[PDB]
């Protein structure tokens, strides 16, 4: 029911091995690291993911430090009210954009 996809706008690549944490209003409850394709599947389950207010926190700063690229943000976080949901993020050192795809 919830997937994250992270892309790198500097290198033109998926953002790989990025830490992602999910919280519900903040109680952490799901987290993982992006795969080779920049995607993080299997965070949660249909049973667990109830309506409510969620935060997806992506650890952009350690991703940029692993690349030797100087970052601005501590993270990127995405807070929304809750179908399948994809939270997509496109990362640059001093900016990020995020959209939700709800199908």
């Amino acid at each position: 029911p919830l997937m994250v996809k992270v892309l790198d706008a500097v290198r033109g690549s998926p953002a790989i091995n990025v830490a992602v944490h999910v919280f519900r209003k903040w109680e952490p409850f799901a987290s993982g690291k992006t795969s080779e394709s920049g995607e993080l599947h299997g965070l949660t389950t249909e049973e667990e993911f109830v309506e409510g207010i969620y935060k997806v926190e992506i650890d952009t700063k350690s991703y940029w430090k692993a690349l030797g690229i100087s970052p601005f943000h501590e993270h990127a976080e995405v807070v929304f009210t809750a179908r399948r949901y994809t939270i997509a993020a496109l990362l640059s050192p001093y900016s990020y954009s995020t959209t939700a795809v709800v199908t």
Copy 2:
């Protein structure tokens, strides 16, 4: 070797049935319409897609008119020098962002 993916930032959805045209420096040579997932596969072939300068033109204005949403841009176009390439676009009525994923 070349795929396009289009997302809608107003509705939170893939952008479906959007016309996409590809040109090589401008000679048109590949075009199609996005699927239900907002993706357009099979534009070209490994043999056809040589190094050079390309333009991907996405017909955003007819997509926004089909939705009853007033657009700004005539289109979105993406011009680059040429692996597999994904051109991703995220659409709003008065803005668009585009990135390339090169794997």
Copy 3:
């Protein structure tokens, strides 16, 4: 030293009368309220803070995009847009945080001078 600018990608306009809340991380690792304000008719919020107040630290700027969209009559996806960043670590700088809003997306960038 800190300004915030907010634009609407649906209407092609400045995002007016948007609430912006700033917090600073405190020593016990909670967020301390630091400054707030609302965007003007140009979508800009100036006068949040002063050179004297704005010390080094980790800040959170939270833009209330939910109430902006509901005041337009639209049901948005996100509760707010934000940036969390470390400020002034090599001395004072001037930071502009710009945010571009749509119902299901936003982007934000920082300009540091």
Copy 4:
């Protein structure tokens, strides 16, 4: 009536000395050169045109992002960033085209007042 603002998402800065070319679609459906300039130290390009010159029509603003990135020593993906839009169709308006640049991406929005 037309301004362009360009920001760098890598450096967190204005994109200075960026070339911007404006074209207008002519009656035979070719692009006619309309105006050009370079961004200032604030990343802004003012004085492109005048109310009198800027009539209704379909414009293309082409931002030379390739030479910006190569002058920084970086090999970018896109040749340029752009917008193509119909201007002044219900009378004069003021248009700001803003663009945010990274080596493999860009976004652009329009603010119309």
